[PDB]
Write a protein that binds this ligand. Structure first.
Ligand SMILES: Nc1ncnc2c1ncn2[C@@H]1O[C@H](COP(=O)(O)OP(=O)(O)OP(=O)(O)O)[C@@H](O)[C@H]1O
Lengths: 123, 266
């Protein structure tokens, strides 16, 4: 039954808005993402459930609700050109000109998010 | 300190959204694959959340899991035969055993804790895995000795301990009161350890009713044993003025746990 999904969406959105009240919409979700940084890839402490979110001012971004500690990550994707698929990472060029590497344990999540990201910052 | 003002209900949603809610359907249907994530949540709860909100109750896995189901819609479509088999599995999952001790002073208000170097390592009770054919008591004696330099074979009591399943391990910490308050600790066989110190129980994150935690200490699997400990001491004090120790143990995942499950589940 579809009821469970309507229910699953509402919980998700509550959980995120509780952490970040500006968030208005969830675009898509990957169950398990690991975060890597540069300087060559280095492993971070942040690893958990990935949510592709849209801001109230319509800013696309993502939340990882970290599994290892209550220290979550939340970054904006300002422009489509700030993202790339290399080496099975979804690579993201932050405002702070850091290079982030997102590892979707599910390759399918990788492709689906990348694509919807491009579409969501297109319109 | 995100969860300091969250209700129990909001905390339950988070842990759900965080660990189990957004799993692929097949993983939710896998007792093992789901039990793992729930084991992670229960620990995240005891170790991180309760630390900023002591109002939140300390729960054994089995109970915590039940309440985590209430905040997970995709699990509501399933049989009583199914949910009972799962709980069964939570009760008897083959888990790595870990033994050690909670070393207390004579006055039972201070305990011995061990810290790695790394800033990512929080203080913890002396504990470790079991060597082949080694006995529970014998493993505890060994871990304490290696980590602490203190030989406890003369004071360890096979009848006095706390059992608890936390983060996918079956922890047993023997409770050894009356440790000399100027014991000198050593860790020469354990090069990883940098500090080994007496801490006041009253300074431990959830120990005293409404003492807030200062952000100046990190603790590993300490907080979860504090509820069973308060209970141990209460009881050991009753015994001290009535008979003689020996009997006093506290099994978190046993009766106390099934009593509470019946109250929820009935
Ligand atoms: N003292 C500690 N402080 C913080 N995190 C810890 C500590 N001990 C273990 N962990 C965490 O627990 C996870 C798994 O435990 P880990 O393998 O590090 O312990 P271990 O010493 O191998 O356990 P065992 O005693 O069973 O061998 C790791 O991700 C690690 O971050």
């Amino acid at each position: 039954m579809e009821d469970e999904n309507i229910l699953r969406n509402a919980v998700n959105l509550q959980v995120l808005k509780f952490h970040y009240p500006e968030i208005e919409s969830i675009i898509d979700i990957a169950s398990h993402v690991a975060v890597y940084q540069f300087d060559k890839w280095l492993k971070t402490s942040i690893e958990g459930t990935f949510f592709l979110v849209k801001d109230q001012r319509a800013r696309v971004g993502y939340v990882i609700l970290n599994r290892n500690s209550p220290e979550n990550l939340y970054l904006f994707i300002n422009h489509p050109s700030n993202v790339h698929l290399v080496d099975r990472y979804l690579i993201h060029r932050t405002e702070n000109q850091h290079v982030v590497g997102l590892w979707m344990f599910d390759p399918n999540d990788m492709s689906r998010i990348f694509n919807i990201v491009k579409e969501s910052l297109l319109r | 300190m995100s969860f300091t003002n969250a209700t129990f209900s909001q905390v339950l949603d988070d842990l759900s959204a965080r660990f189990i809610l957004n799993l692929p359907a097949e993983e939710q249907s896998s007792v093992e694959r789901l039990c793992f994530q729930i084991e992670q949540a229960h620990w995240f709860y005891e170790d991180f959340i309760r630390a900023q909100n002591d109002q939140l109750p300390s729960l054994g896995l089995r109970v915590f899991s039940a309440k985590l189901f209430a905040h997970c819609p995709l699990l509501w479509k399933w049989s009583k035969v199914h949910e009972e088999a799962f709980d069964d599995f939570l009760r008897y999952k083959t888990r790595i055993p870990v033994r050690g001790a909670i070393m207390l002073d004579m006055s039972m208000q201070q305990c011995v804790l061990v810290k790695g170097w790394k800033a990512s390592s929080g203080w913890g009770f002396p504990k470790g895995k079991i060597d082949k054919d080694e006995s529970d008591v014998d493993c505890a004696i060994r871990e304490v000795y290696e980590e602490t330099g203190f030989d406890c074979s003369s004071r360890i009591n096979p009848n006095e301990f706390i059992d608890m399943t936390i983060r996918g391990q079956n922890v047993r910490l023997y409770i050894i009161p009356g440790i000399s308050l100027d014991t000198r600790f050593e860790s020469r066989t354990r090069k990883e350890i940098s500090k080994i110190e007496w801490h006041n129980l009253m300074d431990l994150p959830t120990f005293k009713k409404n003492k807030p935690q200062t952000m100046k200490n990190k603790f590993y699997m300490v907080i979860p044993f504090l509820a069973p400990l308060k209970k141990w001491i209460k009881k050991r004090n009753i015994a001290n003025n009535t008979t003689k120790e020996k009997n006093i143990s506290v099994d978190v995942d046993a009766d106390a746990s099934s009593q509470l499950l019946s109250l929820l589940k009935s």
